[PDB]
Design a protein around this nucleic acid. Structure first.
Lengths: 97, 84, 50, 64
RNA sequence: AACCUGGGGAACUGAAACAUCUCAGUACCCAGAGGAGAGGAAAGAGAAAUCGACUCCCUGAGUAGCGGCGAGCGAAAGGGGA
RNA sequence: AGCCAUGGGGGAAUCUGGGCGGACCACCGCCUAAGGCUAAGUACUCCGGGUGACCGAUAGCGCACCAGUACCGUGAGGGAAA
RNA sequence: GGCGUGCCUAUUGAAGCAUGAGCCGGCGACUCACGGUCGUGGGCGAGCUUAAGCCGUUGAGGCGGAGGCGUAGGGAAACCGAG
RNA sequence: GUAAGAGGAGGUAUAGGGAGCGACGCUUGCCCGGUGCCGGAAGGUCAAGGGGAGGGGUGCAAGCCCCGAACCGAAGCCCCGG
RNA sequence: ACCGGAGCGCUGUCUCGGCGAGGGACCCGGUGAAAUUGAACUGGCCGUGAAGAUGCGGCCUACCCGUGGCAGGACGAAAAGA
RNA sequence: GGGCAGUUUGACUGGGGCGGUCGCCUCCUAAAAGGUAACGGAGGCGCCCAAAGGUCCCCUCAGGCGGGACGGAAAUCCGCCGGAGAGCGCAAGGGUAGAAGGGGGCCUGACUGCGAGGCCUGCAAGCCGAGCAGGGGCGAAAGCCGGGCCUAGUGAACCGGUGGU
């Protein structure tokens, strides 16, 4: 009968408009303990062709685990992720350049 | 049946009575922050390592044991022995 | 309550806030007294608006 | 066919990664003036529980 | 007999009541065209210097939103086929 | 609060005219309106065939049988029994 | 001769002077489709599975990874990230 | 009746529509406060419209779009009496 | 042929009823239905119990089936309380 | 603008109307914790205060009797006995001088960022508070200060105004 516990209030922020919403690229997280298990190099399509991404717009390197030498193909980078690629690992960026 | 007059009233009212009294008795352990007495007046004045606040409440200040006390010319008291 | 009115206090040099109350009947004009700002340190605060 | 998923439901509350429905404290839009900053500070967030289970059934399809 | 294009078109009921909202542009009224209809050569799309007639199925997605921000209502681009 | 179409009034340009990318503008891209036609992919089931972990004469089309027939009703209509 | 207040429904409570049944016969009431949430019998399992449809079959399967769920979450957001 | 028109009426104020009571006889008093109603070339207030002071946004800028002031703005209610 | 009060005549309206007539009702031949129906081997009293009993206790009464006839009851049937 | 249409036109209630009532505070019923009903018994809130708030130095009332210009049971003070019976903003109850009261000085913590652990509890609400950082007010300090002796003085959400990032 009461406010069907509807008395809780919204704070979803911005939460909608009418020109739709912004497509603006998002990032997929990757944990570089999934690195050590994989081998060779890494690339965007390679993860979407894997089982660990698929069309998540772009890719942010991150995560914990064991750092092992190879190269990636990264779209975004955590400070921590830069560090395991300081153990002995490479990385590119943004592409189309 | 004759239902003529009938003297009404203006009385029936009470209170969403909150539950007040000695919340934690003696021999009881507290982790500090546990209130031992919810009272209206000061029927229980602070004890050793027990504090009081705006609503006259004896609560815990440490991790020990509630100890009861009386002092005729000073009032009744509730304390918390250390337990080091 | 209203007609006795309620007011917020505002700093100087632009912004800084709190949430208090007033009273008119006592010959009170510019309600002015100390507080603290979000940024920086102790300041006055002048009576303002709704 | 197909659940409708409630808009308000998602619009004000979230179930954290534990099947725990958590969001908003009630009561601040008309409060104020005689309000101690103590509670405005405690008007930060909340938690909710129990009937929030049914609330987990509400959102359904996307979860969120 | 049904299905189809158009011009008209509700109410119960849903919102636990009722007006906005709803059922629903469904029921019916009519007009007209046929093994079909209508549609159909972008004064479009959408953001990539990417697209390339219209329609149907899957998809996206119950997503983007619309909303006494209630009941609930529910898109297009893109991808796959025809 | 645009785009799409339109009821009253106001009322133009032919490529430095222009419509549009969601108020509005600078800019940057996109498209050529204010004339008319176009198979297929889809839909329907009166109908012809096949098929069914479909029914068995209170079930199954309302009716297997002499049914849109008896009968009822002013009429619209209802509507068997065997 | 020892004993014994029909049935159902409906009740605080029925044998009831509450309720429905003249008798028998046939019919007659917890389905399904989709989306959920949980438990379970399974296959795989850091992954798992395809929708429409192409090909085939006459009671024959296969092909089809487009798409879904899974891997990180936190914030309203930009954005950061086991924080 | 959406209209065209139909009646009223091929009638024309001694006529047609509406209201009250109800043959004939004696008689129908007093209050306009509210309300309805008849009226008034002032006025209070109020719509779209008109006008454009002052201004915003934007762009090199020309320019384009938006906000709206003074006063001008009807019936309506109020107002003056019956 | 509307609603009060009065009187006069008249009278089975009454005292207060008695008789008679026919058509039914009754018996015989022919035809022969309805609503209702939980099942019936269905008595009073005094108690009881959802407060109003054939049925339960207690007592008493009662040879088995009808026909004419009488309506106290079976909370009588009829109307899912106006 | 009832000429016409869709709708609304509460709820409890010793049957309904009628009247009372609808929430919040205190005391009884309330049965030695908690809690508790009833159209049961008695009353209150919809406010207030910039000092009524924080602190530091400081004073102690009511009352009764004894003495007195006005005064006069009662304004005023003198003195003696008097421990809470006065004031404690406003109803009630608890509480109160070993102060909450009453005087002055100073001030504005009627802070911000939080907040362990609790009271209470169908949810949602409400209620308790050390502590920690900031940067302050009082006091030499010790220290308290995140309003008020305590419990009434109140209103989820949606809507939108407001200054601002």
């Amino acid at each position: 009968g009461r406010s069907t516990t509807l008395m809780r209030l919204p704070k979803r922020g911005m939460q909608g408009q009418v020109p739709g919403e912004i497509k603006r690229p998002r990032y997929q997280g990757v944990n570089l303990k999934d690195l050590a298990r994989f081998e060779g190099e890494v690339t965007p399509e390679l993860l979407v062709r894997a089982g660990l991404l698929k069309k998540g717009y772009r890719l942010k390197i991150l995560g914990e685990g064991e750092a092992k030498p190879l190269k990636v193909v990264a779209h975004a980078f955590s400070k921590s992720a830069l560090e395991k690629l300081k153990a002995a690992g490479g990385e590119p960026v943004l592409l189309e350049a | 049946a004759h239902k003529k007059g009938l003297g009404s009233t203006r009385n029936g009212r009470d209170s969403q009575a909150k539950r007040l009294g000695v919340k934690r008795y003696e021999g009881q352990v507290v982790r500090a922050g546990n209130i031992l007495v919810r009272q209206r007046g000061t029927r229980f004045k602070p004890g050793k390592n027990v504090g009081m606040g705006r609503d006259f409440t004896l609560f815990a200040l440490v991790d020990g044991v509630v100890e009861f006390q009386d002092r005729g010319r000073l009032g009744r008291y509730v304390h918390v022995r250390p337990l080091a | 309550v209203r007609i006795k009115l309620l007011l917020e206090c505002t700093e100087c040099k632009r912004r800084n806030y709190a949430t208090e109350k007033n009273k008119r009947n006592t010959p009170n004009k510019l309600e002015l007294r100390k507080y603290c700002p979000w940024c920086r340190k102790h300041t006055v605060h002048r009576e303002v608006k709704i | 066919p197909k659940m409708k998923t409630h808009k308000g439901a998602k619009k004000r509350v979230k179930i954290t990664a534990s099947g725990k429905v958590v969001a908003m404290k009630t009561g601040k839009r008309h409060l104020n003036w005689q309000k101690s900053g103590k509670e405005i500070r405690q008007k930060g967030r909340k938690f909710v529980l129990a009937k929030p289970e049914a609330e987990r059934i509400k959102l359904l399809l996307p979860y969120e």
